[PDB]
């Protein structure tokens, strides 16, 4: 399952960079560079809402992800799928990861990343395949 594995790496790496403030083929690298630019921008422009969403979420710890998975499924339950919703969910994942690290500097981002990746890949498998996976993400968010 190359798609699952590729998606978890991109999403995990972003969340870890965001939470820790450190950055460590070329297709995955383009995806991560796109996600940094777009994801950082979502967070910057939606600071107030993300703060409100975080408050409501009331996440207890690094493993407390079932509520977020329910949120993500509910997001798509109107039958619309698009990259803006997808990157927004990942950006909020990053925003949550930063908060977890604040309360406990030893928290791991993996349960969150895995939770988000599971929703996207499992529930939107064929949509992602038709988009040519992360190549579609890169293309959609391509700016000159």
């Amino acid at each position: 399952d190359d798609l699952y594995r590729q998606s978890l790496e991109i999403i995990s790496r972003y969340l870890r960079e965001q939470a820790t403030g450190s950055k460590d083929g070329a297709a995955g690298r383009r995806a991560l560079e796109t996600l940094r630019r777009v994801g950082d921008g979502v967070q910057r422009n939606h600071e107030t809402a993300f703060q409100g969403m975080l408050r409501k979420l009331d996440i207890k710890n690094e493993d407390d992800v079932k509520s977020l998975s329910r949120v993500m499924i509910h997001v798509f339950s109107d039958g619309v799928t698009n990259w803006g919703r997808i990157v927004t969910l990942i950006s909020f994942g990053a925003f949550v990861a930063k908060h977890l690290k604040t309360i406990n500097q030893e928290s791991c981002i993996e349960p969150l990343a895995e939770s988000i990746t599971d929703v996207l890949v499992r529930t939107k498998r064929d949509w992602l395949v038709k988009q040519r996976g992360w190549d579609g993400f890169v293309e959609f968010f391509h700016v000159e």
Binding site: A49, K56, R70, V71, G84
Partner: peptide, 23 residues
């Protein structure tokens, strides 16, 4: 309702972001 409120917010932002880049 909290989970629905969060979802409503995330959807609004996601559709706004989608529109911005699609235009």
């Amino acid at each position: 309702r909290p989970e629905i409120w969060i979802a409503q917010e995330a959807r609004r932002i996601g559709d706004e972001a989608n529109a911005y880049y699609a235009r």
